[PDB]
Amino acid sequence: GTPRRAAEYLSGRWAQAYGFPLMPIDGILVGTAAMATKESTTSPSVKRMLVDTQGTDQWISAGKAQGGMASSRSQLGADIHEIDNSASRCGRLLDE
Amino acid sequence: TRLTGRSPILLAGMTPTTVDAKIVAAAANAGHWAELAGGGQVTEEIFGNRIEQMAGLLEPGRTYQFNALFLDPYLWKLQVGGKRLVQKARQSGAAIDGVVISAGIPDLDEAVELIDELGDIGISHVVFKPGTIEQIRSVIRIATE
Amino acid sequence: PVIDQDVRRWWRSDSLWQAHDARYDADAVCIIPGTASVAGITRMDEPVGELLDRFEQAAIDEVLGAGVEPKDVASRRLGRADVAGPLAVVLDAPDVRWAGRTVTNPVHRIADPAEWQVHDGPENPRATHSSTGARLQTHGDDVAL
């Protein structure tokens, strides 16, 4: 998320929470934080909802929703993450 | 950065978001690892049109990359396996210098054949993304062999 | 079309492009983000170059806080790491733009890695290939193969 978190994964300072030495890495890839950019072509209402939502740090069990987000099933049965809205309610209803 | 020549912040292949030439060309012109998605170029006409758009949008010198879903069978045969659309675009002279293999890791012999096939035409960045620990150790076996 | 046993297949069949057109409200459409990066993002319609440069600039700040003097490098690649200058860039570049098209680098192509011998006697770097006779002379700040 935040560039502070990007720096603490890049510097290897993240391992002291587990009690290891510095384990640095050399690149981090950013997918979701670029969804609300200028050149991206989502809808502006989707950009507004994506700003206004806020997501948890813990796990979300399958078929439930905790704090803005949700995790549900897919066409083949695989797991996906969704924003908890009228798509996700219908998605977990059809999952049931 | 020493290997590629680009900034260590990347821009992943995303099937709704980075399926578009505007965002992937702007991220490549900024000097970053930009990655055109592969899960939306479903036909040859759309594929050729997006290669044309990217050639229009980039400035001289800049390059971009490409994402290829592996366990999507029809899409994999259209992109890489059966027809070779990424290879034909590179031989025609598009600026693709990287293929990202997503959602699965191939076995040893066909993986080494894929690295050598793309290094023939000059892709020179065939990257993998693994899911689990055994998926990681398989790519350790690839890089050992 | 119908309400049946395959109703999840009918409804979830290709349900991701609808987030990219303005004719649908943001409520009724499938959006698929992550879980911590949604709390990470803050505002609207921001440019991608500034976003990725901010992600790099925080780590640059965190390592510059240790008080390390940065050393001047002529590029970002720095592959061979014993010669510096324009021919460093020419040696480690894998692709060139050769009259509108991206052909792989011919100096790379004659002997792909690192088999060129360097000479910096009177402080003009030059590289030779022994088995063919090719040279990489430097006409001022310009490279001649």
SS in 3 state form for chain B? CCCCCCCCEECCCCCCCCCCHHHHHHHHHCCCECEECCCCCCCHHHHHHHHHHHHHHCCCCCCEEEEEECCCHHHHHHHCCCCCHHHHHHHHCCCEEEEEEECCCCCHHHHHHHHHHHHHHCCCCEEECCCCHHHHHHHHHHHHC
Method: cryo-EM
d(CA C143, CA C66): 38
Residue B22 contacts A where some CB pair is shorter than 8 Å: yes
Which chain A residues are closer than 8 Å to B50 by Cβ?
Answer: none
Nearest chain B Cα to A26, which residue?
B8
Please measure the distance between the N-terminal and C-terminal CA atoms of chain C and give it in whole angstroms: 66
Asked if C100's CB is within 8 angstroms of B30's CB, the reply is no
Quickly count: other Cβ atoms within 10 Å of residue B59's Cβ: 8
β-pair type (C143-144, C137-138): antiparallel
Of C16, C78, C103, the CB nearest to B15: C16
Task: Count Cβ–Cβ pairs < 8 Å, chain A vs chain B.
Answer: 46
Strands (E), A22-68: none
B45 token code pair: 């006409």
d(CA A73, CA C63): 42
Nearest chain C Cα to B30, which residue?
C49
d(CA A71, CA B133): 23
Which chain A residues are closer than 8 Å to B26 by Cβ?
Answer: 39
Asked if A40's CB is within 8 angstroms of B23's CB, the reply is yes
Instruction: Give residues with Cβ within 8 angstroms of C15, minimum separation 6.
Output: A87, C30
Nearest chain C Cα to B2, which residue?
C77
Of B1, B22, B27, the CB nearest to A41: B22
Asked if B23's CB is within 8 angstroms of C95's CB, the reply is no
Q: What is the CA radius of gyration of chain C?
A: 26
Which chain B residues are closer than 8 Å to C104 by Cβ?
Answer: 122, 124
Nearest Cα to Cα of residue C35 among A44, B127, A68: A68
Nearest Cα to Cα of residue C111 among C86, C136, C142, C137: C136
d(CA A16, CA B77): 45
Phi/psi for B141 (5° steps) reads -65, -35
d(CA B96, CA B104): 22
Residue A28 contacts B where some CB pair is shorter than 8 Å: yes
Asked if A82 and C16 touch (Cβ cutoff 8 Å), the reply is: no
d(CA C58, CA A4): 6
d(CA C68, CA C46): 31
Asked if C91 and C74 touch (Cβ cutoff 8 Å), the reply is: no
The structure was resolved to a resolution in Å of 3.3
Task: Name residue, tokens 């990470």.
Answer: C40
Asked if C45's CB is within 8 angstroms of A47's CB, the reply is yes
Nearest chain B Cα to C19, which residue?
B16
